[PDB]
RNA sequence: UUGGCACCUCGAUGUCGGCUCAUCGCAUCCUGGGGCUGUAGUCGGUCCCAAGGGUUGGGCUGUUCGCCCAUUAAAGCGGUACGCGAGCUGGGUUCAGAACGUCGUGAGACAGUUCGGUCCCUAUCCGUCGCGGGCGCAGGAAAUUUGAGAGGAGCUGUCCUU
RNA sequence: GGGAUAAGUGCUGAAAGCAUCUAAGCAUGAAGCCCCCCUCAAGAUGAGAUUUCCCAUUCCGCAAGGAAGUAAGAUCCCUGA
């Protein structure tokens, strides 16, 4: 449970290839925008298909 | 001897 | 100062018939052809060798009692994975990889060795599908 | 019997060399010897 | 040989001609439409394609719609090959039904087994369990990886992992009853897989 | 196996016996095929070819070993740091306490015996067991597939006819 | 259940006019072997094969090539096993 050798810079950067995170499913809000993530109520106008329900 | 009793 | 060819190599196609020769004596000549030892423009890092086609691989023969005594091993990465067959069974079913194992044994080991293995083409006799390349018949030196 | 000292036991024994192996055959089956 | 492929519904029990009680697996496996005939001069081997459980046009692609246009049928959910059937004996678009199997025959049943998730070595490999008492801190663990001298673990060391989801063939099952009206096959014994999964029933290798 | 030497390790290579997991070699315990028998048949003896598979549940003792009970087709020998403690237990060896016998004036000692006695580690890399993301496979795709190769399985008893 | 086999059992036969399981030619023969039973398998860079869709735009780069939109198709997001 003890590291025998230190990790080099290149192996660390290769391990950090998949550490990035993705862009969310964000789309144009039909009321005002911009923008609104899919299948959630818009935080700006408080509308959802298409009534102001807050 | 060689007793493994390390503390 | 001396010449060293690179991307100017002209590669020819040769047909070698294995009806009466050994496994064996022809395989070293084919490996030397594939390395490019017959050309004066040989450069050891650029693969100046040319293509060769071997036909009648089932007609190969080998002297002595090697038909029952010579054993080919194909050990896996598993314990107890030693699998063995004789030279008669390897010739009777499919002698193509018999000939390619001979050439791979006599070729150098490395990236160029795997590249020069790609120019080899071994077929069961006596026709090859490379008539579009117009290969010439090569006779063995002995 | 398999022994590395294959020898003719009696006068009827005959020494032969089947398959590169020294053997003795005889009319008596007790005298049958092989090596290797 | 002959065979047919379908969906199993569940298990029931049927007594037949005596007092004896038989565990019975119910399979919906009809109709199956011949989609493609593989030939040795073109494909290199002899086989037939069977399609089962046709679906809506919304769930089918344009290549899937064009592939079944030759057989004059709707696109189907399950396509598998049978090899080697008695060539030819079937034309492209002919319906294969459950009447090919009599209710005394011996068949081979194959399918994808039920998934168990990532499981330990005791359940996945049947390995024996360590003591729970007399000071022991050892149970539910796979074991020693091997000797010291190779300086490595040999390939094939049984370790925890995902169990199930693989193809399992159960050999020499017997048909109890065939239902031509409701497209049902009644098979003696247990059949691998979960409910409403794809089950392929082929004739056994006799004898 | 018991030894011999002291080449490697004393700025540490954890040492017995069990548990778990195994793998390999036959100088083969059974099963398979045979030769010779002072083999009438069953059961046997010896020597060949054969590692494919399988080779047990207890009582005693820390014990391996060994003896005994009951089976079995048989309860085979060994190697892998006398396989395996960053996988597990400390019963015995092998700490600090206290006794018995013996030796020693004595402090103390005893492969002589007995009672009791802290077993740490969050896995970096190679290895193994599973599951993904890329790119390639000279256009982009949805399906169905051949098989170069690889893994799994491989054991046998009893009864009736002849 | 097939094929080549080990130990064995042999047939026809000469070196050596005989004899002979062998030096040429044919067999038979084991839970060994290679298949038939099951499973993974074209990253098998040697990247295989069959069926069926989509089509051959625009703008630069005179050649190689590079950007934008899209068809077939797939994904982000959501309901779940």
Swiss-Prot record, chain A:
Tell me one GO biological process term: translation
- GO cellular component annotations of the record: large ribosomal subunit
Keyword tags: Ribonucleoprotein, Ribosomal protein
Q: Which InterPro entries match?
A: Ribosomal_bL32, Ribosomal_bL32_bact, Ribosomal_zn-bd
Report the Pfam families cross-referenced here.
Ribosomal_L32p
Any GO MF annotation of the entry: structural constituent of ribosome
Q: How does it assemble?
A: Part of the 50S ribosomal subunit.
The family classification in the record reads: Belongs to the bacterial ribosomal protein bL32 family.
Known HAMAP family for this protein? Ribosomal_bL32
For this entry, the protein name equals Large ribosomal subunit protein bL32
Organism equals: Bacillus subtilis (strain 168)
This protein's encoding gene: rpmF
Swiss-Prot record, chain C:
Asked if the record carries the keyword Aminoacyl-tRNA synthetase, the reply is no
Source domain of life:
Bacteria
CDD domains listed in its UniProt record: Ribosomal_L13
Annotated TM spans:
none
Question: Which PROSITE patterns did the record assign?
Answer: RIBOSOMAL_L13
One Pfam family this sequence matches: Ribosomal_L13
What GO biological process term is on the record, naming one?
negative regulation of translation
Q: Which InterPro entries match?
A: Ribosomal_uL13, Ribosomal_uL13_bac-type, Ribosomal_uL13_CS, Ribosomal_uL13_sf
GO CC aspect terms = cytosolic large ribosomal subunit; ribosome
UniProt KW keywords: Ribonucleoprotein, Ribosomal protein
Kindly list the GO molecular function terms attached to this UniProt entry.
Answer: mRNA binding; structural constituent of ribosome
- Describe the family membership recorded for this protein in Swiss-Prot or TrEMBL: Belongs to the universal ribosomal protein uL13 family.
The entry describes its oligomerization and partners as: Part of the 50S ribosomal subunit. Binds to Obg (AC P20964).
**Function as written in the Swiss-Prot or TrEMBL entry:** This protein is one of the early assembly proteins of the 50S ribosomal subunit, although it is not seen to bind rRNA by itself. It is important during the early stages of 50S assembly.
Q: What is this protein called?
A: Large ribosomal subunit protein uL13
Native species of this protein?
Bacillus subtilis (strain 168)
Curated annotation (Swiss-Prot), chain D:
| UniProt entry tagged with the keyword Ribosomal protein | yes
Q: Which GO terms describe its cellular component?
A: cytoplasm; ribonucleoprotein complex; ribosome
Q: Which SUPFAM superfamilies match?
A: Ribosomal protein L36
- InterPro entries from the entry? Ribosomal_bL36, Ribosomal_bL36_sp
PROSITE patterns given in the database record? RIBOSOMAL_L36
Q: List, in alphabetical order, the GO biological process terms annotated in this UniProt record.
A: translation
Q: Which UniProt keywords apply?
A: Ribonucleoprotein, Ribosomal protein
Family matches, as Pfam families: Ribosomal_L36 (PF00444)
**What GO terms are given for molecular function?**
structural constituent of ribosome
The UniProt record lists the keyword Ribosomal protein: yes
Q: What does the subunit comment say?
A: Part of the 50S ribosomal subunit.
For this chain, the family text in UniProt reads: Belongs to the bacterial ribosomal protein bL36 family.
Q: What is this protein called?
A: Large ribosomal subunit protein bL36
Q: Which organism is it from?
A: Bacillus subtilis (strain 168)
- Gene name of this polypeptide: rpmJ
From Swiss-Prot, chain E:
A single MF term (Gene Ontology)? structural constituent of ribosome
Looking up SUPFAM superfamilies in the UniProt record yields: Translation proteins (SSF50447)
In the UniProt record, the signal sequence range is none
Q: Which Pfam families match?
A: Ribosomal_L3
Keyword rRNA processing in record: yes
Q: Where is this region: Disordered?
A: 121-151
The entry's cellular-component GO terms read: cytosolic large ribosomal subunit
Report if keyword S-adenosyl-L-methionine is assigned.
Answer: no
BP-aspect Gene Ontology terms: positive regulation of rRNA processing; rRNA processing; translation
Entry keywords, A to Z: Ribonucleoprotein, Ribosomal protein, RNA-binding, rRNA processing, rRNA-binding
Q: Which Gene3D superfamilies would you find in this protein's record?
A: 3.30.160.810, Translation factors (2.40.30.10)
Q: Which PANTHER family does the protein's record reference? A: 50S RIBOSOMAL PROTEIN L3, LARGE RIBOSOMAL SUBUNIT PROTEIN UL3C
- Similarity field: Belongs to the universal ribosomal protein uL3 family.
* Protein's job: One of the primary rRNA binding proteins, it binds directly near the 3'-end of the 23S rRNA, where it nucleates assembly of the 50S subunit. Strongly stimulates 23S rRNA precursor processing by mini-ribonuclease 3 (MrnC); 20-30% DMSO can replace L3, suggesting the protein may alter rRNA conformation.
Q: How does it assemble?
A: Part of the 50S ribosomal subunit. Forms a cluster with proteins L14 and L19. Interacts with RNA helicase CshA.
Q: Mind telling me what this protein is named?
A: Large ribosomal subunit protein uL3
Q: What is the source species?
A: Bacillus subtilis (strain 168)
Lineage of the species this protein comes from:
Bacteria, Bacillati, Bacillota, Bacilli, Bacillales
What's the name of its gene?
rplC
